[PDB]
Amino acid sequence: AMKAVCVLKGDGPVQGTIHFEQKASGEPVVLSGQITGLTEGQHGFHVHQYGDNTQGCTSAGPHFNPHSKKHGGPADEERHVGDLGNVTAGKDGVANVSIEDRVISLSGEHSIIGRTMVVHEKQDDLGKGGNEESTKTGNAGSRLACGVIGIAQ
């Protein structure tokens, strides 16, 4: 019965809180929360490798990718473990987040506990942008806000 939480903070206006929950070891992990200050539209939402905030969001490193694969969407076979696709902000600039994923975990070697969630500047192209960036970052651009994923009550 795992639960985690993540508070997102950056230099700019973007912030938010992401709650995680996983009933058991072989179960999907359900994310819920909200992000504010986003420009309207889809924004790439990824788990990055390191829970390192010494240089802002930069020190989080690449998308969490223990299996040395290429960037893709959550539904794809070829994906980094931390590829959660996009979240969507309205004209509001507010994004309700609700994502269910079977590839990320709150325990075992796939464990995202102690890693970083980041929401990105642009939409994640899910690996179909026709350049190398696409197969790497999904062309989602700069890191607006991030937090270390921590164990929650």
- Judged by beta carbon, residue 60 or residue 144, the one nearer its own copies is 60
Cα torsion 131, 134, 137, 142 to 10°: value is 70
Binding mask 11-30 for its own copies (x = CB under 8 A): ------x-------------
| Position among 70, 88, 113, 136 found at the interface with its own copies (CB under 8 A) | 113
Residue 71's binding partner, choosing from its own copies, Zn ion, none, with beta-carbon cut-off 5 to 8 A by kind?
A: Zn ion
Is 83 catalytic? The answer is yes
Is 151 among the residues that bind its own copies (CB under 8 A)? Answer: yes
Annotated catalytic residue, options 43, 79, 115, 143: 143
Q: How far is Cα 84 from Cα 117, in angstroms, rounded to an integer?
A: 10
Q: How far is Cα 7 from Cα 14, in angstroms, rounded to an integer?
A: 11
Residue 30's binding partner, choosing from its own copies, Zn ion, none, with beta-carbon cut-off 5 to 8 A by kind?
A: none
Q: Which of 96, 90, 6, 13 is nearest to 46 (CA)?
A: 6
Is 71 catalytic? The answer is yes
Q: What are the residues whose beta carbons fall under 8 Å from the beta carbon of 65, sequence distance 6 or more?
A: 49, 80, 81, 82
| Position among 54, 77, 109, 131 found at the interface with its own copies (CB under 8 A) | 54
Binding site for Zn ion (CB under 5 A): 63, 71, 80, 83
Identify whether the C-beta of residue 104 lies closer than 8 Å to the C-beta of residue 110.
yes
Binding site for its own copies (CB under 8 A): 4-5, 7, 17, 49-54, 61, 113-116, 147-153
